[PDB]
């Protein structure tokens, strides 16, 4: 069995190997990359996402989100307070202000220490989940707006045509902006490109051990667990690496830098934080190997998770017994 310790793997495809996206994901899996839940892909030196980032300041962040924490430094939840609209140029100036900017630090490990010590005492503002793309239309390789759609994959594998669309999302971050522990909708893959700015640190639990994270989460967030049998779908709970280690939960960590891709694999729980002002683009995708994960994915039906239009068909076709309850939670 390849990668039996479930380490995060880093790949350096050549320009020739960068042509065929599906083939390269399958290659990474042949080497055991999925066992980690997360892989890094460094693009060939010949490749670029677009020519420059000099003309992005007028993008609008319609609903910036202030991420307010509750709990203790290593075990906390966050809620999202809506703020007034602002442009990316305005948000960049805010991220660089004395109130929000990255503190002085020695290296990524010192900044990680400072994150976990101090995150709860601040409320950073995240420009998340903005439909759109920063890839040039002429970029033909690993262009996250030109991937094969999940609806087409389900049709190819299973024979059933379904409604829905699959487009990318932009994320504008600042110091301490946080992504809570989660797997993707329907335990899909995700791919994330860091277009510009400061790094993003990731934590991930191997898919084979995801239920160990779920059991810890139920212990640590006992009111939330009574409320919903899949409350990590709410995307609000944080648990630090120190707490994971104290509780014996297998995990790994890695820092993504500008110009690098990350892929999350089906049922790979992940969480993390941004180092300073940055912009990322991400999208969900599927392969043949996903179908069995989609059929077994948990679902939130309490009403909290609320998701896109396109998840309806995935539940309806892959999980017909669960459909009626899940749809009630959507309505
Ligand atoms: O970058 C973020 O805030 C969160 N991203 C992801 O969870 C992802 O790409 O799967
Ligand atoms: Mg602009
Ligand atoms: Ni994700
Ligand atoms: Zn729920």
Coordinates of C-alpha atoms and ligand atoms in Angstrom, one line a residue:
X1 CA 0.0 0.0 0.0
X2 CA 1.5 3.4 -1.0
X3 CA 1.9 6.1 1.6
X4 CA 0.9 4.0 4.6
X5 CA 1.7 6.6 7.2
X6 CA -0.7 9.1 5.3
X7 CA 1.9 11.9 4.9
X8 CA 1.1 15.0 2.9
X9 CA 2.8 14.5 -0.5
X10 CA 4.2 17.4 -2.7
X11 CA 4.3 17.0 -6.5
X12 CA 6.3 18.8 -9.1
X13 CA 4.6 18.0 -12.5
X14 CA 6.5 18.9 -15.7
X15 CA 4.8 21.1 -18.3
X16 CA 3.9 17.9 -20.2
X17 CA 2.4 16.3 -17.2
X18 CA 0.3 19.5 -16.5
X19 CA -1.8 19.1 -19.6
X20 CA -4.2 16.5 -18.5
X21 CA -5.8 17.3 -15.1
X22 CA -7.7 14.1 -14.6
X23 CA -4.7 11.9 -15.5
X24 CA -2.5 13.8 -13.0
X25 CA -5.0 13.4 -10.1
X26 CA -5.1 9.7 -10.8
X27 CA -1.3 9.6 -10.9
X28 CA -1.1 11.3 -7.4
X29 CA -3.5 8.7 -6.1
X30 CA -1.4 5.8 -7.6
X31 CA 1.4 7.1 -5.3
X32 CA -0.9 7.2 -2.2
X33 CA -1.5 10.9 -2.0
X34 CA -5.1 10.7 -1.1
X35 CA -4.3 8.8 2.1
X36 CA -3.2 12.1 3.7
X37 CA -6.4 13.9 2.8
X38 CA -4.4 16.8 1.2
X39 CA -1.6 17.2 -1.4
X40 CA 0.5 20.1 -2.6
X41 CA 1.1 20.7 -6.4
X42 CA 3.9 23.1 -7.4
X43 CA 3.2 24.1 -11.1
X44 CA 6.0 23.9 -13.7
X45 CA 8.1 27.0 -13.9
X46 CA 6.8 27.7 -17.4
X47 CA 3.2 28.1 -16.1
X48 CA 1.3 31.2 -14.9
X49 CA -2.3 31.7 -13.8
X50 CA -2.5 35.2 -15.4
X51 CA 0.0 38.0 -16.4
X52 CA -0.4 40.3 -13.4
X53 CA -2.5 41.0 -10.3
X54 CA -2.2 44.8 -10.8
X55 CA -5.8 45.3 -11.8
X56 CA -7.9 43.5 -9.1
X57 CA -8.7 46.3 -6.7
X58 CA -12.1 47.1 -8.0
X59 CA -13.5 43.5 -7.4
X60 CA -16.4 43.9 -4.8
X61 CA -16.6 41.9 -1.6
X62 CA -20.4 42.4 -1.1
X63 CA -20.6 40.8 2.3
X64 CA -17.3 40.7 4.2
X65 CA -17.5 38.4 7.3
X66 CA -16.2 39.3 10.7
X67 CA -15.2 36.0 12.4
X68 CA -16.1 36.2 16.1
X69 CA -14.8 33.4 18.4
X70 CA -16.2 31.9 21.6
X71 CA -14.5 29.3 23.8
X72 CA -10.9 28.7 24.8
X73 CA -7.8 29.2 22.8
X74 CA -7.5 25.7 21.5
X75 CA -11.2 24.7 21.4
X76 CA -13.6 27.4 20.0
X77 CA -16.4 28.2 17.6
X78 CA -16.7 31.2 15.3
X79 CA -19.7 33.0 14.0
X80 CA -19.8 35.2 11.0
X81 CA -21.0 38.8 11.4
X82 CA -21.9 40.5 8.2
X83 CA -20.2 43.8 7.4
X84 CA -20.8 46.5 4.8
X85 CA -19.5 46.0 1.3
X86 CA -16.0 47.0 0.3
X87 CA -13.7 46.7 -2.7
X88 CA -10.6 44.5 -2.7
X89 CA -8.5 47.7 -2.6
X90 CA -10.3 48.8 0.5
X91 CA -10.1 45.3 2.1
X92 CA -6.3 45.2 1.4
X93 CA -5.8 48.5 3.1
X94 CA -7.8 47.2 6.1
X95 CA -5.8 44.0 6.3
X96 CA -2.5 46.1 6.4
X97 CA -3.8 48.5 9.1
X98 CA -2.3 48.4 12.6
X99 CA -5.4 46.7 14.0
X100 CA -5.4 43.7 11.5
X101 CA -1.8 43.3 10.2
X102 CA 0.4 40.3 10.7
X103 CA 2.7 40.7 13.8
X104 CA 6.4 40.5 13.6
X105 CA 7.5 36.9 13.6
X106 CA 10.6 34.7 13.1
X107 CA 9.3 32.0 10.8
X108 CA 6.1 30.1 10.0
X109 CA 6.3 28.0 13.2
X110 CA 6.5 31.1 15.4
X111 CA 3.5 32.6 13.6
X112 CA 1.6 29.4 14.1
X113 CA 2.3 29.6 17.8
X114 CA 1.0 33.1 17.9
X115 CA -2.2 32.1 15.9
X116 CA -3.1 29.5 18.4
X117 CA -2.3 31.6 21.5
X118 CA -4.1 34.7 20.4
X119 CA -6.7 34.0 17.7
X120 CA -9.7 34.1 20.0
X121 CA -9.0 37.6 21.2
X122 CA -9.4 39.2 17.8
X123 CA -12.1 39.2 15.2
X124 CA -10.6 39.3 11.6
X125 CA -12.6 40.0 8.5
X126 CA -12.7 37.4 5.7
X127 CA -13.9 38.1 2.0
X128 CA -15.1 34.5 1.4
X129 CA -17.1 32.6 -1.0
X130 CA -17.2 35.3 -3.9
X131 CA -18.3 33.7 -7.2
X132 CA -15.7 34.4 -9.8
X133 CA -12.2 33.6 -11.2
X134 CA -8.8 35.2 -11.6
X135 CA -7.4 32.7 -14.2
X136 CA -6.8 34.2 -17.6
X137 CA -9.0 32.7 -20.2
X138 CA -6.0 31.8 -22.2
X139 CA -4.5 29.7 -19.4
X140 CA -5.2 26.2 -20.6
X141 CA -3.6 24.0 -17.9
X142 CA -5.1 23.8 -14.3
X143 CA -7.5 26.6 -15.0
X144 CA -10.1 26.2 -12.1
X145 CA -12.9 27.8 -14.2
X146 CA -12.4 25.2 -17.1
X147 CA -12.5 21.9 -15.2
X148 CA -14.9 19.0 -16.1
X149 CA -18.1 19.6 -14.1
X150 CA -19.3 17.3 -11.2
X151 CA -22.7 17.0 -13.1
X152 CA -20.9 15.7 -16.1
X153 CA -18.9 13.2 -14.0
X154 CA -22.1 11.9 -12.3
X155 CA -23.6 11.5 -15.8
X156 CA -20.6 9.7 -17.2
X157 CA -20.4 7.3 -14.2
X158 CA -24.0 6.6 -13.5
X159 CA -25.9 7.5 -16.7
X160 CA -28.3 10.1 -15.3
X161 CA -28.3 13.6 -16.5
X162 CA -28.9 16.2 -13.8
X163 CA -29.4 20.0 -13.4
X164 CA -26.8 22.2 -11.7
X165 CA -23.6 24.1 -12.3
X166 CA -20.1 24.1 -10.8
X167 CA -18.2 27.5 -10.7
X168 CA -15.2 28.7 -8.7
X169 CA -15.0 30.9 -5.7
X170 CA -12.6 33.6 -4.6
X171 CA -11.4 34.2 -1.0
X172 CA -9.7 37.4 0.2
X173 CA -8.0 36.8 3.6
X174 CA -6.1 38.6 6.3
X175 CA -4.1 37.7 9.3
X176 CA -6.0 35.2 11.6
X177 CA -8.9 34.6 9.1
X178 CA -9.9 31.0 9.8
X179 CA -11.4 28.0 8.0
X180 CA -13.1 25.7 10.4
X181 CA -12.8 21.9 10.5
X182 CA -14.9 20.4 7.6
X183 CA -15.0 18.0 4.7
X184 CA -16.4 19.2 1.3
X185 CA -20.1 19.1 0.4
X186 CA -21.0 15.5 -0.4
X187 CA -17.4 14.6 0.6
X188 CA -16.2 16.0 -2.9
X189 CA -12.6 16.9 -3.7
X190 CA -11.5 20.5 -3.6
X191 CA -8.7 22.3 -5.4
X192 CA -7.3 25.6 -4.1
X193 CA -4.9 28.0 -5.8
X194 CA -3.2 30.7 -3.8
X195 CA -3.1 33.6 -6.4
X196 CA -1.2 36.2 -4.4
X197 CA -0.1 37.4 -1.0
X198 CA 0.8 35.8 2.3
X199 CA 0.6 32.1 3.1
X200 CA -2.2 29.8 4.2
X201 CA -1.5 27.1 6.9
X202 CA -3.5 23.8 6.6
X203 CA -4.3 21.0 9.0
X204 CA -5.7 17.7 7.7
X205 CA -7.0 14.3 9.1
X206 CA -6.4 11.2 6.8
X207 CA -9.8 10.1 5.4
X208 CA -9.4 6.6 7.0
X209 CA -9.4 8.4 10.4
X210 CA -12.1 10.9 9.9
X211 CA -14.5 9.3 12.4
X212 CA -11.8 9.8 15.1
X213 CA -12.1 13.6 14.6
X214 CA -15.9 13.4 14.6
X215 CA -15.9 11.6 17.9
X216 CA -13.6 14.1 19.5
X217 CA -15.7 17.0 18.1
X218 CA -18.8 15.5 19.7
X219 CA -17.0 15.4 23.1
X220 CA -15.6 18.9 22.8
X221 CA -18.8 20.6 21.5
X222 CA -21.5 18.7 23.3
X223 CA -24.4 21.1 22.9
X224 CA -23.7 21.4 19.1
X225 CA -23.6 17.6 18.8
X226 CA -27.0 17.2 20.5
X227 CA -28.4 19.8 18.0
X228 CA -27.2 18.0 14.9
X229 CA -25.8 14.6 14.1
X230 CA -23.4 16.2 11.4
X231 CA -22.7 19.5 13.0
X232 CA -19.2 19.8 11.5
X233 CA -21.2 20.6 8.3
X234 CA -21.9 23.9 9.9
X235 CA -18.3 24.9 9.5
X236 CA -17.8 26.7 12.8
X237 CA -15.6 24.5 15.1
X238 CA -11.9 24.8 15.6
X239 CA -9.6 22.4 17.5
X240 CA -5.8 23.2 17.8
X241 CA -3.0 20.9 16.9
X242 CA -2.0 20.7 20.6
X243 CA -5.5 19.5 21.5
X244 CA -5.5 17.0 18.6
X245 CA -2.2 15.6 19.8
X246 CA -3.4 15.3 23.4
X247 CA -6.3 13.3 22.2
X248 CA -4.3 11.0 19.9
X249 CA -6.0 12.2 16.7
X250 CA -3.9 11.5 13.6
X251 CA -3.2 14.7 11.5
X252 CA -0.7 16.6 9.4
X253 CA 0.1 20.2 8.7
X254 CA 1.6 22.1 5.8
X255 CA 1.9 25.8 4.7
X256 CA 0.8 26.8 1.2
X257 CA 2.5 29.8 -0.5
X258 CA 1.5 32.0 -3.4
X259 CA 1.7 30.2 -6.7
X260 CA 0.9 26.7 -5.3
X261 CA -2.1 24.4 -5.5
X262 CA -3.6 22.3 -2.8
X263 CA -6.0 19.4 -3.4
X264 CA -8.2 18.0 -0.7
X265 CA -9.5 14.4 -1.2
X266 CA -12.9 12.9 -0.4
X267 CA -13.6 12.8 3.3
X268 CA -10.3 14.6 4.2
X269 CA -11.2 16.9 7.1
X270 CA -9.3 20.1 7.0
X271 CA -8.9 23.5 8.8
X272 CA -6.5 26.4 8.7
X273 CA -5.7 30.1 8.8
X274 CA -4.2 32.9 6.6
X275 CA -0.9 34.6 7.5
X276 CA -1.8 38.0 6.1
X277 CA -3.5 39.6 3.1
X278 CA -4.0 37.0 0.3
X279 CA -6.3 35.9 -2.4
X280 CA -7.2 32.2 -3.1
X281 CA -9.5 30.5 -5.7
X282 CA -11.1 27.2 -5.0
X283 CA -13.7 24.8 -6.6
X284 CA -15.1 21.3 -5.9
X285 CA -14.6 18.5 -8.4
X286 CA -15.2 14.8 -8.7
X287 CA -13.5 11.7 -10.1
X288 CA -14.8 8.1 -10.5
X289 CA -13.4 7.3 -7.1
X290 CA -15.5 10.0 -5.4
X291 CA -18.9 8.2 -6.2
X292 CA -18.7 5.8 -3.3
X293 CA -17.8 8.7 -0.9
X294 CA -20.7 10.7 -2.2
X295 CA -23.1 7.8 -1.5
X296 CA -22.0 7.6 2.1
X297 CA -21.5 11.3 3.0
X298 CA -23.2 12.5 6.1
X299 CA -25.6 15.1 6.0
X300 CA -26.9 18.0 8.1
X301 CA -30.7 18.2 8.1
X302 CA -31.1 20.6 11.1
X303 CA -31.3 23.6 8.9
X304 CA -27.9 25.2 9.7
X305 CA -25.7 24.0 6.9
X306 CA -27.7 25.6 3.9
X307 CA -25.9 24.9 0.6
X308 CA -26.0 25.5 -3.1
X309 CA -28.6 24.6 -5.6
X310 CA -26.5 21.9 -7.2
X311 CA -26.3 19.7 -4.1
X312 CA -30.0 18.8 -4.5
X313 CA -29.4 16.4 -7.4
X314 CA -26.4 14.8 -5.7
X315 CA -28.5 13.9 -2.6
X316 CA -31.5 13.0 -4.8
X317 CA -29.6 10.5 -7.0
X318 CA -26.9 9.2 -4.6
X319 CA -28.9 9.2 -1.3
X320 CA -32.6 8.8 -2.1
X321 CA -33.5 7.5 1.4
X322 CA -32.0 10.6 3.0
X323 CA -33.4 13.1 0.4
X324 CA -36.8 14.0 2.0
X325 CA -35.3 14.8 5.4
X326 CA -32.3 16.7 3.9
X327 CA -34.6 18.8 1.7
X328 CA -36.8 19.7 4.7
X329 CA -33.6 21.1 6.3
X330 CA -33.0 23.1 3.1
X331 CA -36.6 24.6 3.5
Ligands
LIG1 O1 -9.2 28.9 1.8 C1 -10.2 28.7 2.6 O2 -10.7 29.6 3.4 C2 -11.0 27.4 2.7 N1 -10.7 26.5 1.6 C3 -11.0 25.3 1.5 O3 -11.7 24.7 2.5 C4 -10.8 24.5 0.3 O4 -10.2 24.9 -0.6 O5 -11.3 23.3 0.4
LIG2 MG1 -10.6 45.3 -10.4
LIG3 NI1 -12.5 22.9 2.1
LIG4 ZN1 -27.0 20.7 11.3

